[PDB]
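Q: Could you predict the 3D structure of JetC?
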Amino acid sequence: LQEQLQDKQALEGILPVWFAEQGYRLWLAETNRLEKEHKQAELDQAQCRSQLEIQKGVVDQHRQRYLRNLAVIKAELDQAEALRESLDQQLQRLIEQCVQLKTQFDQAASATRKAYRGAEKGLSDTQRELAQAHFPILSTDDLGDIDELERKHTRELQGQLKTLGEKLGDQKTELAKRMSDALKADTG
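A: Sure. Here are the predicted structure tokens for JetC:
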């Protein structure tokens, strides 16, 4: 019973490090994805700003030509200014997305770093070898499933430890009673 209890204690000690390592891998992947998305959003916002400058120049040229049967030129200006507002709107949307992306990116980084600070423990070795056969490998879609599975394994192992402790206490009481009976039979 003592040996079984020790084995369960060892497994319970091993579990959290492995789960933290899996979480670190998942958060690193997520951070890489969000980094790529944020960089693409920044490129798009630079492109849209350049387009806005070009459209402003076009509007300025149209209005300058009109201000000097000239009303037709005004029509051109109208078209230009119309495009301008749409482009302006696009910029706004993009900015929001960029900000959103950046915010999300930051979160991922923090998570990764947090997970990096959670999975920096060493001595993986044969302990990690046992963990890979005792605990599942978690996928990036298992964002909250890490906590769920870790808590489930912890509860199961705690119940096993409690049952083993109950059995060990019962066996110790049995041994004490048997030794007492032997002493009673013993003459000295």
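Q: Anything worth pointing out?
A: The CA atoms of residues 59 and 79 lie 9 Å apart.
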